[PDB]
Amino acid sequence: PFVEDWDLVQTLGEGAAGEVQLAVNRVTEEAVAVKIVDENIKKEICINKMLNHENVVKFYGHRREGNIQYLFLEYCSGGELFDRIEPDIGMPEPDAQRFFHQLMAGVVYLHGIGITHRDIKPENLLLDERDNLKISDFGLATVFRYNNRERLLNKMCGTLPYVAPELLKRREFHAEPVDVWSCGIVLTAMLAGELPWDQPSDSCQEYSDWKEKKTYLNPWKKIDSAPLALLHKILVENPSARITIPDIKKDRWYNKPLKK
Numbered sequence: 084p085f086v087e088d089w090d091l092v093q094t095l096g097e098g099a100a101g102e103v104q105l106a107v108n109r110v111t112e113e114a115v116a117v118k119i120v121d122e123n124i125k126k127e128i129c130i131n132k133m134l135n136h137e138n139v140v141k142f143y144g145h146r147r148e149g150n151i152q153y154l155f156l157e158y159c160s161g162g163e164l165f166d167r168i169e170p171d172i173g174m175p176e177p178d179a180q181r182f183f184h185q186l187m188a189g190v191v192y193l194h195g196i197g198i199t200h201r202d203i204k205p206e207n208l209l210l211d212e213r214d215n216l217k218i219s220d221f222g223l224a225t226v227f228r229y230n231n232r233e234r235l236l237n238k239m240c241g242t243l244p245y246v247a248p249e250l251l252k253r254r255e256f257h258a259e260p261v262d263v264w265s266c267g268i269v270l271t272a273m274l275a276g277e278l279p280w281d282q283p284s285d286s287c288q289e290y291s292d293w294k295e296k297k298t299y300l301n302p303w304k305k306i307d308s309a310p311l312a313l314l315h316k317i318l319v320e321n322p323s324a325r326i327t328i329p330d331i332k333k334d335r336w337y338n339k340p341l342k343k
C-alpha cells in the first residue's frame with residue numbers, strides 16, 4: 084500500500100509549458116522529477132518512451148489528471164551542467180573532456196535510433212549522483228530517420244547562441260550536423276565560460292572573427308590548442324564539411340589522456 088503516492092517537495096525548474104518538481108515516494112523515498120504541463124506533449128511522451136540509455140534522462144511514465152499532464156522523469160542530484168560552468172572561466176579541461184565524451188555517447192545513441200534533440204545546451208544537460216551527464220527535455224525533439232529513410236528538417240527551433248548557421252540560411256537541412264554544432268558550442272562554454280556569439284550570422288562580428296580565424300580573441304584565446312583544433316572542425320559553417328561524430332571519436336584531444 085501507498086507505494087503509488089508521491090510528495091512534491093521542491094521546485095526544480097520553470098518553463099513555457101509549466102514547472103518541474105522534485106517528487107519523493109511516500110513508502111520507498113525514491114526521488115523523481117515531475118514535469119507538470121497545463122500535439123507537443125503527445126510527441127514528447129512518444130519520443131521519451133523510445134529512450135533507454137545511460138546518458139539520456141530516464142522516462143518512468145505519464146499520468147493525465149484532467150487537463151494537466153504529469154511526466155515522471157529521472158531526478159539528477161548533480162543538477163544542471165550550466166552550474167558547473169564558472170562565468171568567463173569554464174571548468175578544468177579533464178572535467179570538460181569527460182562530460183564531452185558522455186554527451187557524444189548520448190547523441191550517438193539518439194541519432195542511431197533516428198532522434199534529433201534540436202536544443203542541446205548546458206541547461207538541458209543534467210548530472211546524476213556520480214556526475215554522469217544525461218541529455219534532458221525532448222519537447223523540441225523529432226524523428227529525422229524512419230524505415231532507414233532520412234527526412235530533411237525545415238523548422239526553426241533551438242536557442243540562437245547554440246543553433247547551427249544553416250538553420251538561419253537554408254530552407255532545408257540535415258538533422259545530425261545541427262546537434263553536432265550545438266555540442267561544439269557546449270564544449271566552448273565548458274572551456275571558456277562564455278558563448279562565442281549571440282547567433283551564427285555574418286551580421287554578428289564575433290561570428291565573422293571566427294570565420295576569419297581570429298583565435299587570439301576571446302573565448303578562443305582561453306582554450307588550449309588541442310581542444311581548439313577540435314572546435315575548428317565542429318564549428319564549420321558548411322554542414323556538409325562539418326566533422327561527424329565517428330570522426331570526432333578519432334580526434335587527437337578527444338583521445339588525449341587527461342587528469343587534474
Ligand SMILES: COc1cc2c(cc1Cn1ccnc1)Cc1c-2n[nH]c1-c1ccc(C#N)cc1
Pocket residue numbers: 094095096103116118140156157158159160161162163209219220221222
Ligand atoms: C539537484 O538540482 C537539480 C536537479 C534537477 C533540475 C535542476 C536542479 C537544480 N535546482 C535545485 C533546486 N532548484 C533547481 C532539473 C531536473 C533535475 N532532475 N531532473 C530534472 C529534469 C528531468 C526532466 C526534464 C524534462 N523534460 C526536466 C528536468
